């Protein structure tokens, strides 16, 4: 009722000159260009175009003014400390087919929050210390109005990861509500260059990278491979227990082909994580007085 919505109908063909009409101006008004605006009333109306030079050439569009529900639009939810996370929102109606949205949404003023996971009892107006949270909600700038990155999106926010761990994010408007859980994490080796004699062997250890995805966990992986399609003649790579592996020397590393062992750790795409974290690191290798 407060937030009039806008779209644009376009005519193709005829004598290049038009007149525009609406069968109910209390639901939708049309302009001389084909822009349409919702008015004080919901329901159903028709918008009509007519050729000036002989009014028998004409066509019409149906406009319907109707919502049920709000979601946070799916994005990545695993991010590093010191980075920002984009979250957006989308409107639904239970009158729409599954896989159909509204053609446009301007409803940007949403009640976005960060939620704290321990706040069970204390109905008290205390200024809680903004030190224990993993995340913070960023301010909206008062710069020039952006183009929304898609037109169906009600509102968009960024959340800065301050500290390791997680927070819940929440949204409300007119009783409709959404929530999501977001995580702050980075990957490292102990060894920075693996330089070994003929037949010498080393154990290598690693820290950080994603947890096995909470709900499913079999979507997780660790992966360890070298930058050659032919490995088994030059080095032997053997995974260890937990975050460890082994490198055993087989033959001399040619200096015109520097060898790197890549460690990847991540979650695979699922129906509960569509945009998972999967970082890697490359570790240099060599086989070669007193």
């Amino acid at each position: 009722p407060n937030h009039r919505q806008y779209s644009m109908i376009r005519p193709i063909g005829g004598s290049g000159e038009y007149n525009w009409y609406t069968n109910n101006s209390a639901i939708v008004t049309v302009d001389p260009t084909g822009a349409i605006t919702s008015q004080t009333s919901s329901g159903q109306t028709e918008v009509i175009v007519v050729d000036k030079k002989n009014p028998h050439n004409r066509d019409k569009v149906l406009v319907i003014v109707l919502p049920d529900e709000i979601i946070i639009t799916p994005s990545q939810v695993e991010v590093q400390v010191g980075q920002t996370l984009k979250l957006s929102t989308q409107l639904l109606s239970k009158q729409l087919s599954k896989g159909v949205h509204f053609d446009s949404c301007n409803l940007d003023d949403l009640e976005w929050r960060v939620d704290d996971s321990n706040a069970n009892n204390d109905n008290n107006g205390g200024g809680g210390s903004n030190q224990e949270r993993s995340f913070s909600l960023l301010p909206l700038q008062k710069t020039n109005t952006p183009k929304k990155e898609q037109p169906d999106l009600c509102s968009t926010r960024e959340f800065l990861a301050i500290k390791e761990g997680s927070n819940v994010i929440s949204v409300s408007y007119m009783g409709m509500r959404a929530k999501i859980l977001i995580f702050a994490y980075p990957l490292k080796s102990d060894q920075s260059e693996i330089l070994l004699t003929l037949g010498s062997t080393l154990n290598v250890f690693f820290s950080g990278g994603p947890e096995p995805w909470h709900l499913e966990r079999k979507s997780h992986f660790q992966s360890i491979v070298s930058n050659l399609t032919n490995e088994q003649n030059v080095l032997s790579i053997v995974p260890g227990n937990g975050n460890s592996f082994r490198v055993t020397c087989l033959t001399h590393t040619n200096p015109s082909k520097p060898i790197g062992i890549e460690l990847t750790i991540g979650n695979k795409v699922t129906t509960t994580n569509p945009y998972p974290a999967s970082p890697s690191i490359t570790i240099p290798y060599s086989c070669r007085s007193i």
Binding site: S117, N121, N123, N124, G126, G127, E132, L215
Partner: protein, 242 residues
């Protein structure tokens, strides 16, 4: 998940005295400031991942009730789950010990703590459904993945010095007084600032005393995360016998 069992108090009659909301907000605003540094305590339990044992600081010499909160794996708590059998454990029954409350199989249990300082791990498991409640309802058993039905917590079990001194009256002669035992979050007070000034910093273990006049200073301390043993209401009840 393990949680501390916050029992209701007695349902005293609901007077509508609006003034109570002010003193509730005064306590909530103090609690919101205290929540910056109370984070290590058993009252600050953050919802764990499966197998993610948390260390929590707790004071010795008391009994404490705990609750085994059961969820579906959508994350909803169940409305009733009085068909499951529970398994209450501790790593050391000297340091921390489950009592012999009547229902040793229930989703509630009472933990007694020693008079020491130290560390002990508490655990609850589920063993399955009760076969006799299922048999009475004529229901078939369905076999539970009890490997996913365990929760654990690590409990870390936990004075001014000098207690008496004689300060020679000179504006350069300052005493340090330091708070041995507590959360390292302290507030210091004294009987009479005309005898001596106090000086301390936020989150200091200690306060400095500066001599203004002859006499006796008394200095006192409150713990910001653990409070003070001056719980007078319980002292009224015991005075009839003690």
């Amino acid at each position: 998940q393990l949680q501390v069992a916050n029992l209701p108090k007695d349902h005293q009659i609901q007077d509508s005295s609006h003034h109570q909301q002010i003193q509730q907000q005064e306590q909530q605003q103090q609690q919101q400031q205290q929540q910056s540094t109370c984070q290590d305590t058993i009252f600050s339990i953050k919802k764990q991942k499966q197998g993610e044992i948390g260390t929590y600081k707790i004071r010795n010499d008391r009994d404490i009730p705990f609750i085994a909160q059961v969820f579906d794996d959508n994350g909803k708590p169940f409305t009733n789950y009085s068909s499951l059998v529970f398994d209450w454990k501790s790593s050391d029954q000297t340091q921390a010990k489950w009592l012999r409350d009547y229902n040793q199989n229930d989703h509630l249990s009472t933990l007694s703590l020693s008079k020491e300082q130290g560390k002990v791990i508490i655990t609850v498991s589920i063993l399955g459904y009760d076969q006799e409640l299922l048999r009475q309802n004529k229901i078939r058993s369905s076999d539970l993945d009890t490997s996913k039905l365990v929760s654990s917590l690590e409990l870390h079990l936990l004075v001014l010095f000098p207690d008496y001194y004689t300060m020679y009256l000179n504006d350069k002669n300052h005493l340090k007084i330091e708070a041995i035992g507590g959360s390292k979050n302290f507030a210091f007070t004294s009987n009479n600032s005309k005898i001596a000034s106090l000086s301390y910093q936020p989150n200091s273990d200690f306060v400095t005393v500066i001599p203004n006049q002859q006499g006796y200073l008394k200095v006192e301390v409150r713990d910001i995360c653990l409070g003070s043993d001056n719980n007078k209401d319980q002292q009224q009840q015991y005075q009839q016998k003690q």
